[PDB]
């Protein structure tokens, strides 16, 4: 799982920081990315890893600003005093008690064969 | 005359004591073969060892058709003797070998005895000081 995470998260720039535009602006996909970065920093998430899969697959338009309306994926790394290095963030990811379990779920949700509603 | 039979015929001539016989039997095969096999010029030590051992084990397989030899012990001795041979060709040659092969009369024991009595450096420590005290010269020149 660790070798997989690095292969997928290893680019010229921090992968999460690159995800600060695209189509994900106020989506649950964006709130997920912000929630994942907070986990790496603190170890605590607003929505359980076992609840994100159904929320992301449906991607409701109801309300995503209720999770984190203020922060942006780029700003969490400076506010939370994280290291943008790919290796540093993976180590800070897995060192948490539920690290490898959260990582396996995240890899599935971002890179796996998720059934997404059209 | 298969090599396995000829080596076995010769080994039968060693004096017997008891179970110690397998230690001295294995040692002699290791000594003869480790020193007899020629080295190939294109190989480094790592490869020369793998090749020399492969042949040594095959020799034991043939010998063990005639006379019992402990395979693991004989290989242990073989590798030790082979490393000594490799060290001599790349490393320091003992003065007993220059003496044995070549007016040479006063031997190393003769100076190591005096050093031991006075509790000073022996021949080997002086030899180490020589090279060390010479390291700078040889490295500087070519």
């Amino acid at each position: 799982v660790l070798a997989c995470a690095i292969r997928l998260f290893s680019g010229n720039y921090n992968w999460f920081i690159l995800q600060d535009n695209n189509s994900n602006i106020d989506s649950y996909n964006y709130q997920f990315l912000l929630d994942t970065v907070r986990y790496i920093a603190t170890g605590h998430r607003r929505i359980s890893i076992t609840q994100w899969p159904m929320l992301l697959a449906t991607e409701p338009d109801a309300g995503a600003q209720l999770i984190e309306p203020r922060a942006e994926i780029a700003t969490l790394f400076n506010e939370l005093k994280l290291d943008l290095d790919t290796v540093s963030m993976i180590q800070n990811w897995v060192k948490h008690k539920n690290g490898m379990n959260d990582l396996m779920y995240t890899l599935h949700l971002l890179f796996g064969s998720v059934e997404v509603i059209d | 005359q298969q090599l396995g039979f000829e080596l076995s015929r010769i080994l039968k001539q060693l004096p017997n004591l008891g179970g110690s016989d397998r230690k001295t039997r294995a040692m002699l095969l290791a000594n003869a073969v480790a020193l007899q096999i020629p080295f190939e010029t294109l190989l480094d030590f790592d490869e020369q060892q793998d090749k020399a051992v492969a042949k040594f084990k095959k020799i034991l397989s043939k010998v063990n058709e005639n006379i019992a030899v402990d395979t693991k012990l004989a290989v242990t001795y073989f590798n030790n003797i082979l490393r000594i041979r490799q060290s001599l060709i790349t490393g320091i040659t003992d003065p007993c070998l220059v003496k044995a092969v070549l007016n040479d009369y006063l031997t190393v024991d003769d100076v190591n005895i005096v050093s031991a009595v006075v509790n000073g450096p022996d021949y080997n420590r002086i030899q180490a000081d020589m090279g060390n005290a010479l390291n700078q010269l040889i490295g500087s020149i070519d």
Binding site: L2, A3, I6, R7, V87, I90, Q91, V94, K95, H96, K97, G99, M100 | D46, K72, L73, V75, T76, N79, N80, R83, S87, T90, G91, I92, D122, N124, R125, Q127, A128, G131, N132, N135
Partner: protein, 176 residues
Amino acid sequence: TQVLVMPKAVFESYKTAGVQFNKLLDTNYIVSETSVNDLAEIHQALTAFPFLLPEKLDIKLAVSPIIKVAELGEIDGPEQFKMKDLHNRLESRLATNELRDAGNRNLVYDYYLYPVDENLWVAVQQSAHIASSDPRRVSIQLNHTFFDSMINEMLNTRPRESVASTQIFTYYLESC
């Protein structure tokens, strides 16, 4: 545990001869089953071990046999003077090796981990590779299967969360 680095040549002798690996930390046993050159090469291989072990997890690098011999030569007992004679032989043989392999200079070794109990981590020093530009990074990439072997073993006793914070865990991630 305690990591004991030894060249492949010494390791294969121990395995072929059948030397108890458990008692290689006991000076009185290793000197009986180990040649003077092998003991000197173990010292040299320890001094060429580039990696910092997880001291925070009580994983230490073994003290070389030469130091242990030197210490016993200064301690009263029935074998003190035999141990002093062994020390002198080790110093002359070590200096002889240092004068011969000084040319090695710019290279890094592959290491193989052979766990022996929980108090000894035999680290076999295998084939050398040439590395002059950033040999630290080259050593890390080469020893991928050494880093994950160490991680697998310490996760048997140490907590996963603690191992994840070590430099050995980091080196694995940097390699892949």
